[PDB]
């Protein structure tokens, strides 16, 4: 009788302490981020340290992790504005749900990929990097972002072929570590990745980039823009055209986060700026 009230007092001191740690974590920095490979819906049976405070997610959601509560539970938040911190199930917790189910029944994809804390921005299109039309249109966008997001942004040139991140292998792995590091302070990261012309080239990496498709809708327009640069550039018209066609054949919702098909620079810039400001709010709660 009076020992059932001792059991309840045990549960709720434990909840009070977990709650306290949760309150404190609000102002702690983000330690790392994950991209989810699975979905999770909180349920009473999961034994949340503070009931009502579990974080539910779908596959391909992003989580900011601040710290560990115990081996079953981390503390963090979904990367979404309005979403404040709560309890995230550890990879051990999620595997033990399966394992528990299997050990009782008898009677390999990790649930998380570690990703940069700020997804880095990679621009692809309108055609091949290394030729003038593509290099100059992208440069104008890089110049815009450096000004609009002064104080909140790191822009970096990546010359290494980081598509090989699924001698060189050393340089590539080094560039991946540097990108993770730039992102750790929660500034916007923007890559000028010289070797990346197609979203598939970064698929197997764990950069989880925001892919920006700078799209010239009309092939005739691109054809004339290239020729407008003269014979040296016009000599390589063919490689540029197929590079552009390949991008246009990508399934959009699967391949791209942002598509800039505006023919005026200011409109393309403001479309991109809107997206990145929304991403900033998602990654920077007022909590």
């Amino acid at each position: 009788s009076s020992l059932e009230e001792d059991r309840e007092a045990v549960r709720r001191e434990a909840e009070r302490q977990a709650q306290a740690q949760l309150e404190k974590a609000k102002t702690k920095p983000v330690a790392f981020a994950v991209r989810t490979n699975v979905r999770y819906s909180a349920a009473q049976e999961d034994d949340v340290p503070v009931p009502g405070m579990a974080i539910s997610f779908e596959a391909k959601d992003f989580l900011h992790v601040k710290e560990k509560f115990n081996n079953d539970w981390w503390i963090g938040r979904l990367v979404k504005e309005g979403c404040e911190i709560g309890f995230i199930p550890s990879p051990v917790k999620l595997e033990n749900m399966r394992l528990q189910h299997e050990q009782r029944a008898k009677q390999h994809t990790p649930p998380y990929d570690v990703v940069p804390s700020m997804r880095p921005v990679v621009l692809v299109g309108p055609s091949l990097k290394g030729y003038e039309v593509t290099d100059m249109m992208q440069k104008a966008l890089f110049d815009f972002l450096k000004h609009r997001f002064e104080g909140r942004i790191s822009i970096t040139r990546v010359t290494a072929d980081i598509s090989l991140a699924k001698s060189s292998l050393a340089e590539v792995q080094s560039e991946i570590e540097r990108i993770f590091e730039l992102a750790r302070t929660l500034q916007l990261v923007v890559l000028d990745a010289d070797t990346i012309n197609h979203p598939a080239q970064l698929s197997k990496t764990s950069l989880a980039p925001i892919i920006v498709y700078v799209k010239i809708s009309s092939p005739k327009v691109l054809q004339r823009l290239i020729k407008s640069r003269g014979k040296s550039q016009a000599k390589h018209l063919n490689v540029q055209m197929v590079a552009a066609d390949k991008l246009a054949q990508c399934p959009p919702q699967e391949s791209f986060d942002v598509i800039l098909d505006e023919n005026q620079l200011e409109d393309a810039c403001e479309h991109l700026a809107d997206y990145l400001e929304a991403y900033w709010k998602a990654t920077h709660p007022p909590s």
């Binding site: 003038e132 039309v133 290099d135 100059m136 249109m137 440069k139 104008a140 110049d143 010239i216 809708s217 009309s218 005739k220 327009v221 004339r224 823009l225 407008s228 505006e262 023919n263 005026q264 620079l265 393309a268």
Partner: peptide, 19 residues
């Protein structure tokens, strides 16, 4: 004038800003 000439001039101006 055509949509194509318009797009073209948009992107030619875009490119001049990088010069």
């Amino acid at each position: 004038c055509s949509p194509l000439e318009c797009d073209l001039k948009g992107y030619l101006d875009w490119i001049t800003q990088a010069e």
